[PDB]
Symmetry: D2
Subunit: 308 residues, 4 copies
């Protein structure tokens, strides 16, 4: 399997990504690390433990990371005051909180495993990844690659041109996108295609298990968020899906940089589609989703998880 | 006919726009005004007089405008694209600065009858707006070639006409008048394919040969910027004035980035929903390719050999 | 006398500048041109005509200029009332065109531009007729502040209200003297100065005292100091350059910064450049400055 | 003694700061941590170990920190014209400077450690974001950097802030108390011929080391000067030793990150009315004779180790 670290801020779609990464046999979750986002670090960390309980994830450290973006002030109409819809939390989690800061855990894991065996899969702001890069620069060449859900070369949500994960910590994104490692940006241009349509939702329900139920409950809290004018798009699992099977989406190799200064455009992932296209480029952007293959991967992972 | 003022920086694109405006029966050129860009004001004013000579354009003042952008600073070519200048131009230069000519024409003509058609940097337009604010409500509308909501050429995200004077663009886009942005998203479709160039060649007149010669010169000069055939840009704005069904448009808020490290000069269009009901700006989307080239070839035919 | 064009946004301190320019014989006022500032162009143009009425200024065109800054967004004078009709007529020309016309029609190097408001008219004139730049003698402006701000921690009002226009002016090749806040915060209207103004005993003196009393109330309330009169300092420099010290240093205008937009950035590092077209005013000769102001009020007297 | 951590990029100024902290009885060095600046992290770390050897500093961990700024890109022998020894006596702690800083602050009682940065603020900012509890636990920060009316790296920016403006913005916008000893203060710490002769008369190896390297860099950087050579970084240590060595003013101070001309400026708001609360203050006027007395005294107390 491909070993991954899932760095996230759950978050309903982060939860679906955790389910996909756990249930699919082609990826091995080495850790779930959390970062401040559009819920406080405390809240998304509680949510990550909740998702890990529901999916019965054992043997995988869950470590809390950065409580604040690098430079920007902290930034919930999407995922709830909870971060996880209207779900009931247990009195007690089975999933313990690792004692390490996520940044130290990411470093420890990368430095102890063989080179080029871990893929980083960030699906929140990039603060933890950037901190780890600056605290231990040797991780950059040791990582296999980075596949992040974030950005948008021609679509914004947080602003006309910026996507939330980059927008909440542009400086951290700038750090991640300007290191020499290979980066795949699974941005809004891709993830707006990952539609949780009624048909897809019925297939989710036909699994008939506690995680499928949890998922559709949080997902129609999400669906009523996205109605108020599309179906819920489930962004973050798209990044995990690419690690499972890169043919699930097309990509294009182009330069991508992060705007830090502009009054209208801070947080933009500026992708250069001009000619000539670079024949060697460490960044690529995702373009077209294979919708059927993607939803097949998500439903297969739910079936595999069963009822822990 | 639609009266227009063509503010430009020829430029092969601007030359084709001038031919289209002059040849097409539905446009009345009131002036050709020139502006600095990546070429100097003096060079493009010489080019504009060459274009006017070749098309036989009489009775239309040609006026030189701003020599520098508002705030920003800033080979082997005989004449324009290896077409020599005559020893002296037949077309004279109007004595007035383009900024003053634009004001004078707008204020002296009845209201809501003149369309401004900028196809270079927006410096003259912005100067005229700040010097005589009454022109804004008096102008029918503005149809400019420039910008790009998901495209760039000067940078990954900015187009030349906006990039060379972002401040002037910010002025033009933030006035209350109706603005149609015919950006690179649209003009990338106006490809001068081999079949199109054969039809141009078959017009068989000196302006057609002039257009093809200069287009070829610039197709070779800028070969490294393309993955397909040469395109023409600026005439698309004139075409929109002639027949607005030549392209589709979407009403959307558009603003100009002025202080981005990577994005200065970007036309930032907000496509998010909900889209505002009343937008004074719209962006051009899809070109009617056959109709566009039919208009261009028709204008050349009608110009004939002056 | 040195011919000047006084470009202003009255404004009590602009009023004092107009009085100084009119009353002192070393300067010849060719025009008073107005520009939008903190008050609208219409309002400061009414104020300029009022000030011209009060001082009996005749033969000097008063021309209204730009209604808006280049790019940025935006019961007579203090408590004096306007007359029902001004004696001073509003010129028909836009200030930008009047500035161009005067410069092009006079011999080269005979006119000094004295801006004491936002620089919008000056910048427009520069871009519309670039020949004025080499033709102007120099520019002496009240604006900016190399180590002092008021509109922000680091920006002065006149530059802050139109940074792009200031950038245009400071980056042309003509000679620029920046009389900024570092200098003008010294031009204090102390009780002794106000008593000497009172004792001139003319209607223009009493006008200046009334509006500067309106000004002292707001400077005590908002800055915890006596009233400073900024704009006449720039006129004073044209009258007599020994009224203040200057230092020749590069100066540029910040346009982008989140904290520093509008700042006049002066480079005091060594080595200094041998050829520098900008200089900044530093130390005011207080007694000489206020002497010049009082002498001009006495010369105007109670005018025709 | 007041416990400090000296986070630095030696650097002859930093060397004098280290000598002053080591020789003066009022301060106790808990650690010397290094950060990239104008010279590479590797180089200034070799320099720090050289300085520690020369001063005979034992029992004080020397730890290498960040090799790059947070966001921005980056006859000499060893240090100036002093060659390194074949092996240093002073060993490198194995911890990253950022982890040593956190460990020291978290293991000591609250409000007993003063951070004294004299290089880019990258390590400090990283430690803040990795372990936010350090911010309330630190007694205060006294940094050499910035310039409210003076620049060297640009017309308005000082090198330490300019090399990592983002890390400065982090350090200046935390709630802890910050004293900025900037160029407006330090341009006064002149090393006049009188001072240099007195330093020479101390007659020790550290004194000759300081004079030799300062002379080297004074010649190399003398067209950028209108007067004698200046020491900068020890002024922050001097403040910790005796706050009356310089005057201060409480004013808001922020860091410009997106200016065309002004990125890296410490923007100090001197306008009235001054705010209710200020957690930052700037140094203004130096007690010249007391500062140089303190430096020469530290050199005498160190002796020849
Ligand atoms: Ca997420
Ligand atoms: Ca053009
Ligand atoms: Ca004024
Ligand atoms: Ca010690
Ligand atoms: Ca240092
Ligand atoms: Cl003269
Ligand atoms: Cl000075």
């Amino acid at each position: 399997p491909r070993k991954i670290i899932l760095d996230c801020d759950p978050g309903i779609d982060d939860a679906v990504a955790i389910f996909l990464a756990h249930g699919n046999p082609e990826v091995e979750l080495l850790a779930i690390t959390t970062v401040v986002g559009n819920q406080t670090l405390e809240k998304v960390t509680r949510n990550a433990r909740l998702v890990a309980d529901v999916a019965g994830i054992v043997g995988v450290p869950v470590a809390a990371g950065c409580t604040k973006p690098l430079v920007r002030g902290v930034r919930s109409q999407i995922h709830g005051e909870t971060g996880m819809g209207n779900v009931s939390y247990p009195p007690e989690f089975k999933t313990k909180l690792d004692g390490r800061h996520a940044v130290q855990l990411i470093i420890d894991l990368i430095m102890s495993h063989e080179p080029k065996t871990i893929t980083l899969v960030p699906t929140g702001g990039l603060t933890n990844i950037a901190m780890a890069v600056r605290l231990e620069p040797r991780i950059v060449d040791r990582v296999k690659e980075v596949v992040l859900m974030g950005g948008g070369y021609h679509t914004g949500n947080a602003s006309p041109v910026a996507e939330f994960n980059v927008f909440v910590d542009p400086e951290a994104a700038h750090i991640v996108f300007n290191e020499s490692w290979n980066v795949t940006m699974v941005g809004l241009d891709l993830t707006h295609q990952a539609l949780a349509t009624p048909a897809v939702q019925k297939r989710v329900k036909e699994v008939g298990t506690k995680p499928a139920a949890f998922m559709l409950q949080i997902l129609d809290f999400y669906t009523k968020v996205y109605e108020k004018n599309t179906y819920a798009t489930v962004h973050d699992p798209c990044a995990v899906a690419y690690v499972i099977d890169p043919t699930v989406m097309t990509t294009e190799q182009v330069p991508v940089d992060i705007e830090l200064n502009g009054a209208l455009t801070t947080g933009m992932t500026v992708a250069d589609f001009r000619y000539p296209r670079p024949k060697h480029c460490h960044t690529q952007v995702a373009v077209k989703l294979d919708f059927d293959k993607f939803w097949c991967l998500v439903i297969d992972a739910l079936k595999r998880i069963g009822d822990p």
